[PDB]
Amino acid sequence: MEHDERTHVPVELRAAGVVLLNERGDILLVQEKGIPGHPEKAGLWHIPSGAVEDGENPQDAAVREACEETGLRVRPVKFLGAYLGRFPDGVLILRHVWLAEPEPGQTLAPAFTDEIAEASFVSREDFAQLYAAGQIRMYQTKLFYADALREKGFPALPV
Amino acid sequence: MEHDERTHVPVELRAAGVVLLNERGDILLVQEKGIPGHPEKAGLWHIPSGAVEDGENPQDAAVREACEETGLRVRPVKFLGAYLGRFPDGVLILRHVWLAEPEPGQTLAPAFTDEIAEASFVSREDFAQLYAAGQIRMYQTKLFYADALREKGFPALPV
Ligand SMILES: Nc1ncnc2c1ncn2[C@@H]1O[C@H](COP(=O)(O)OP(=O)(O)OP(=O)(O)O)[C@@H](O)[C@H]1O
Ligand SMILES: Nc1ncnc2c1ncn2[C@@H]1O[C@H](COP(=O)(O)OP(=O)(O)OP(=O)(O)O)[C@@H](O)[C@H]1O
Ligand SMILES: [Mg+2]
Numbered sequence: 517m518e519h520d521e522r523t524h525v526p527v528e529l530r531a532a533g534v535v536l537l538n539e540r541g542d543i544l545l546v547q548e549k550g551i552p553g554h555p556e557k558a559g560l561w562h563i564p565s566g567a568v569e570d571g572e573n574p575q576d577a578a579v580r581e582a583c584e585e586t587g588l589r590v591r592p593v594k595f596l597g598a599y600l601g602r603f604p605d606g607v608l609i610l611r612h613v614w615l616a617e618p619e620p621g622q623t624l625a626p627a628f629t630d631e632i633a634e635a636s637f638v639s640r641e642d643f644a645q646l647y648a649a650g651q652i653r654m655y656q657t658k659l660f661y662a663d664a665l666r667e668k669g670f671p672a673l674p675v
Numbered sequence: 676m677e678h679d680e681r682t683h684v685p686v687e688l689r690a691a692g693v694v695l696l697n698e699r700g701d702i703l704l705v706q707e708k709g710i711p712g713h714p715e716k717a718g719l720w721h722i723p724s725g726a727v728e729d730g731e732n733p734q735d736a737a738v739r740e741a742c743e744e745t746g747l748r749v750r751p752v753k754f755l756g757a758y759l760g761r762f763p764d765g766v767l768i769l770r771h772v773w774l775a776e777p778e779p780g781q782t783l784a785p786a787f788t789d790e791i792a793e794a795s796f797v798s799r800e801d802f803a804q805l806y807a808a809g810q811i812r813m814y815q816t817k818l819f820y821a822d823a824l825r826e827k828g829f830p831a832l833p834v
């Protein structure tokens with residue numbers, strides 16, 4: 517919108533994920549297999565998310581990725597936000613996040629790969645511990661988890 | 676998700692709007708209060724959108740802006756996409772777009788301001804003429820309109 521000129525900033529990559537909360541306000545997180553190189557790794561945690569195919573709807577991608585990584589069919593409830601990152605080579609990536617809910621009567625069955633060690637529901641209290649411990653890959657996860665808790669009417673994160 | 680390092684690219688401004696279609700697949704557009712040119716304003720057209728307050732939900736902003744500019748209460752149906760622009764001074768603006776539908780039993784009553792001349796529903800055929808005529812401010816409007824038509828199962832656009 518509106519008549520103030522601006523140039524286009526091409527975004528080569530797009531990712532879409534979800535902040536999936538269960539009835540208790542626990543968050544579904546995915547753990548990386550291990551850290552790249554040093555000690556005997558111990559992967560960090562992040563929200564279920566993946567690449568949006570070129571031209572495909574980001575919201576649908578978030579739903580698809582969530583199922584592919586956790587085995588759970590989820591329903592997008594509300595868009596929470598998108599943020600921008602830039603890889604060393606200059607490539608831009610726009611990450612999208614939706615507040616989602618799992619369809620009823622499902623069993624968590626993560627897709628173990630060279631990138632995913634497992635996935636699981638983590639309570640607000642333990643999430644606070646993970647965050648303080650530097651175990652949450654992207655700090656934005658805490659920001660969006662907080663947004664989701666507010667949206668659903670759940671208690672805020674202790675830390 | 677990912678362990679590949681990337682830097683943060685701050686986005687100072689956020690806008691949110693809608694591709695609002697009625698039952699016939701006509702699109703709701705807003706016209707500028709004349710473009711500055713030579714003797715002639717003749718306003719360009721764009722979808723209803725507006726600024727997202729810092730910290731406010733983008734989706735809710737799209738709904739709010741749509742009502743403020745057209746007088747119509749709309750519901751958000753599905754996220755369509757977001758794209759990035761950069762003003763001459765370097766400021767980045769991320770525009771968000773949702774497919775939306777108006778609540779039933781409403782009357783179009785545009786908010787006339789120094790920025791808005793009027794707003795109205797335009798058919799697919801006339802939209803194509805407007806686009807060919809260079810009267811659509813942001814070409815992305817055509818891209819998203821086409822996305823919306825596909826999502827709703829409406830026939831495609833002549834432009
Ligand atoms: N220009 C680039 N330079 C360096 N690495 C890149 C670039 N583009 C993408 N990546 C690599 O490709 C993958 C980027 O992720 P992609 O957008 O495909 O999906 P995603 O896993 O949902 O998002 P994220 O990039 O965090 O993995 C990165 O994990 C990284 O290894
Ligand atoms: N740093 C900046 N430098 C120059 N112009 C700016 C800057 N920030 C915002 N603008 C102008 O502000 C307006 C955007 O305001 P806002 O985000 O509220 O609504 P918008 O319609 O979504 O944005 P825009 O009209 O810019 O696409 C535009 O007219 C744009 O040119
Ligand atoms: Mg994938």
Ligand SMILES: [Mg+2]
Nearest residue numbers: 529530567568
């Ligand atoms: Mg990608």
Ligand SMILES: [Mg+2]
Nearest residue numbers: 531565566676
């Ligand atoms: Mg991802």
Ligand SMILES: [Mg+2]
Nearest residue numbers: 517690724725
């Ligand atoms: Mg706008």
Ligand SMILES: [Mg+2]
Nearest residue numbers: 725726727740
């Ligand atoms: Mg406004």
Ligand SMILES: [Mg+2]
Nearest residue numbers: 688689726727
């Ligand atoms: Mg703004």
